[PDB]
Design a protein around this ligand. Structure first.
Ligand SMILES: Nc1ncnc2c1ncn2[C@@H]1O[C@H](COP(=O)(O)OP(=O)(O)O)[C@@H](O)[C@H]1O
Length: 317
């Protein structure tokens, strides 16, 4: 009586029932479940997530080298969430946030709750009190690395020179997740890479439903003079869709994730926009000869690149 595929399913089902939808899943599988998500502001990355954005009520971690593009995405999330009429809280602990830029990304700073904790404990706690209030859609934390314990913030000797930070970070998540689910608020934990872990990413890794690995990969020289930098995000972990997908998206200086950029990329691979010979075209239209000229084309003739986005939106989701 051995039938693998029938015996496998029964097992898989059990596996999912004992540990939750997504415990295990074939890699090239398509997903009925839409969740309800917060657009990552990166169409590519969105598809890359397989639900069109950051799932809600889950602990997300966006890690990666400095200036890779983590924040911007975390900020875009916020902005979107707020358009959907959601309230957002920024548990700042690095003091870098540029509200100005943030508004340019569409964030409504004036309605954005900001907190700058005195300690790691406080920082996580303050965020917990807010989470379980239920009034939030998304709550971003800046720099897991900065969630330094109190005994360390205050002057405490190199005795009980423990593995204390990550501890703090586990207990805090052990209880904040439960509420995030009940609350359905999405927690984006920005965790940045170092010197020479993060002493606190050890816990996260296991408590995060989604873990994006943000990376810098190119300087958009364009007309041989800097505009912005191209980014690549790997979805190393996804418990709401098949993991390991990949997306690339532009981020010009001063500007956030380039919509037209996205369009001209996703367009090409998905072939609605056919072009090569170092030139670009759509439905026979002369877009221009460099990704930039094109980006600009779309940026200007708003009408086009709208039917494209459309055309692309259809074929995917
Ligand atoms: N305050 C700013 N002013 C101008 N450009 C910015 C600013 N912050 C971010 N950017 C742009 O957004 C990109 C990503 O920034 P950011 O997300 O802060 O890097 P990180 O990965 O350390 O969080 C930067 O490379 C730059 O192109």
């Amino acid at each position: 009586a051995p039938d693998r595929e029938k015996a496998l399913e029964l097992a898989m089902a059990q596996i999912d029932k004992n540990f939750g939808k997504g415990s295990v899943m074939r890699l090239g599988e398509e997903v009925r479940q839409p969740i309800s998500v917060i657009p990552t502001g990166s169409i590519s990355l969105d598809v890359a997530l397989g639900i069109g954005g950051l799932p809600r009520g889950r602990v997300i971690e966006i890690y990666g080298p400095e200036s890779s593009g983590k924040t911007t995405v975390a900020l875009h999330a916020v902005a979107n969430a707020q358009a959907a009429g959601g309230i957002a809280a920024f548990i700042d602990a690095e003091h870098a946030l540029d509200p100005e830029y943030a508004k340019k990304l569409g964030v409504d700073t004036d309605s954005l709750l900001v907190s700058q904790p005195d300690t790691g404990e406080q920082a996580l706690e303050i965020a917990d009190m807010l989470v379980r209030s239920g009034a939030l859609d998304i709550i971003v934390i800046d720099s897991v690395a900065a969630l330094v314990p109190r005994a360390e913030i205050e002057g405490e000797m190199g005795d009980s020179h423990v593995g204390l930070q990550a501890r703090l970070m586990s207990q805090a998540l052990r209880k904040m997740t439960g509420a995030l689910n009940n609350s359905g608020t999405t927690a984006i934990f920005i965790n940045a890479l170092r010197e020479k872990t993060t002493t606190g990413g050890k816990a996260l890794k296991f408590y995060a439903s989604v873990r994006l690995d943000v990376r810098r990969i190119e300087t958009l020289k364009d007309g041989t003079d800097a505009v912005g930098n191209r980014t690549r995000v790997k979805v190393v972990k996804n418990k709401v869709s098949p993991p390991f997908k990949q997306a690339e998206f532009d981020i010009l200086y001063g500007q956030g994730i380039s919509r037209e950029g996205s369009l001209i990329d996703m367009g090409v691979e998905h072939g609605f926009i056919r072009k090569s010979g170092s030139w670009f075209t759509y439905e026979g239209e002369q877009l221009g000869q460099g990704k930039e000229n094109a980006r600009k084309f779309l940026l200007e003739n708003t009408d086009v690149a709208n039917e494209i986005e459309k055309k692309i939106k259809e074929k995917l989701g």
